[PDB]
Amino acid sequence: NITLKIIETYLGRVPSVNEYHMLKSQARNIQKITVFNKDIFVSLVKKNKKRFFSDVNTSASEIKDRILSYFSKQTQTYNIGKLFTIIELQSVLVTTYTDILGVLTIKAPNVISSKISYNVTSMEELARDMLNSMNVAVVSSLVKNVNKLMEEYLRRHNKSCICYGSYSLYLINPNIRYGDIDILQTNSRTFLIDLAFLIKFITGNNIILSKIPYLRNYMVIKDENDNHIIDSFNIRQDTMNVVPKIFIDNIYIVDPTFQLLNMIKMFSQIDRLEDLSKDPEKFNARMATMLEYVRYTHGIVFDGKRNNMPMKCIIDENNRIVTVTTKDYFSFKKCLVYLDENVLSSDILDLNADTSCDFESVTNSVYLIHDNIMYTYFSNTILLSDKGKVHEISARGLCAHILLYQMLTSGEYKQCLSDLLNSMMNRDKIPIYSHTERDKKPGRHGFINIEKDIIVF
């Protein structure tokens, strides 16, 4: 049997009755593995070694040695389950390595980038101001090497991997210190699994690809000692296409207009007001840069004008929701914001008319317009300035949340954003009376181990 001959080739032995029964369906993938040119491969691994890990003690043999051993470990393995892992991880390598890390050994054009420079200084005080009104609360060594690879990877994979956070803003204002590079991928696992191998192969130290459940399609690779190396959120091509983007020197970054919106929501989360009191300046720069981007780019002027923002955020201290009229900025009456995700899908079918949007970890909630009304979920602590009263800070995070939807759908948001940004100037420090808790979410903390062959979910 052609199939039997394939299994036999791969396992380098006569397949047991069980080994045949359990591996049949995988002849297709198994064959591709056998045929894989391990030489051209061993090449790419070394073209990446002297390219991003040039700082390591290793012969172009020690590497090919580890590589060839791995592509043969299916011989010294009899545990069905463990064979499944080897096949699974080998396939990923065979069918994706070249297209993902291999593309990082073909020099790109020396684009004479231009970039724009921002006077994120006139705004340095304006930011410090807003931030004060609110301050009212209470890692492996490979990371350098890996962040270095992402610098390039972002450049070689613009359509599948975009950027945000520190580094994304360091690309607008070079003085922004930056560490880990926040990314979104449509192929998070594929990427992490490939990079995970690259490292084990070079380094020799097994790493673990782990999946965190609280988070929407979150994944991260650590080392034997539980030290963070690099993470990433996965999104659909669906969602990727709708995310606000900007194109700086060969990479896409979430539109800073959008990131600013998110950072206003993040300020509701009590853990953040806590990060703020530690080092208030830490945020100054970021905020500033984002204030200046939106000013210069959309002609936003900080007049500290009127009110009309923040609008009304009526909260059910018990049924835990937050009706908020939007009669003003959008063609939909108000917005009901559920504090419990489960309770959203529960009550979201009692409407039937289903034409909702799921923006995964990008909005970290789902949005549904119905009856000229909006149903969405807020995933942070709601703050209260007084019993039964939403605190300006949450009030604003609530507005920004709704605006995130607007940006991903192309609706009007420029005027509202400005009112929102100015509602933040010159405002008396209000006390956090008390706050709610984020809703618990059990799940499967599973993880791919690079050498012991076990796949936990």
UniProtKB/Swiss-Prot annotation:
BP-aspect Gene Ontology terms: mRNA processing
SUPFAM superfamilies: Poly(A) polymerase catalytic subunit-like (SSF160957)
Induction: Expressed in the early phase of the viral replicative cycle.
Alphabetized UniProt keyword annotations: ATP-binding, Calcium, Early protein, Metal-binding, mRNA processing, Nucleotide-binding, Transcription, Transferase
Domain of life: Viruses
Gene Ontology MF term list: ATP binding; metal ion binding; poly(A) RNA polymerase activity
Positions annotated to bind Ca(2+) 2: D180, D182, D231
Pfam family, one: Pox_polyA_pol_N
Catalytic residues (positions): D180, D182
Binding-site residues, Ca(2+) 1: D180, D182
Catalytic reaction list: RNA(n) + ATP = RNA(n)-3'-adenine ribonucleotide + diphosphate
Family annotation (InterPro entries): PolyA_pol_cat_Poxvir (IPR004976), PolyA_pol_cat_sf (IPR037265), PolyA_pol_nucTrfase_Poxvir (IPR024231), PolyA_pol_nucTrfase_sf_Poxvir (IPR038419), Poxvirus_polyA_pol_cat_C (IPR024397), Poxvirus_polyA_pol_cat_N (IPR024398), Poxvirus_polyA_pol_cat_N_sf (IPR038337)
Assigned EC number: 2.7.7.19
Keyword Metal-binding: yes
Subunit structure: Heterodimer of a large (catalytic) subunit and a small (regulatory) subunit.
Record-stated family: Belongs to the poxviridae poly(A) polymerase catalytic subunit family.
Function: Polymerase that creates the 3'-poly(A) tail of mRNA's.
Entry protein name: Poly(A) polymerase catalytic subunit
Organism field: Vaccinia virus (strain Western Reserve) (VACV)
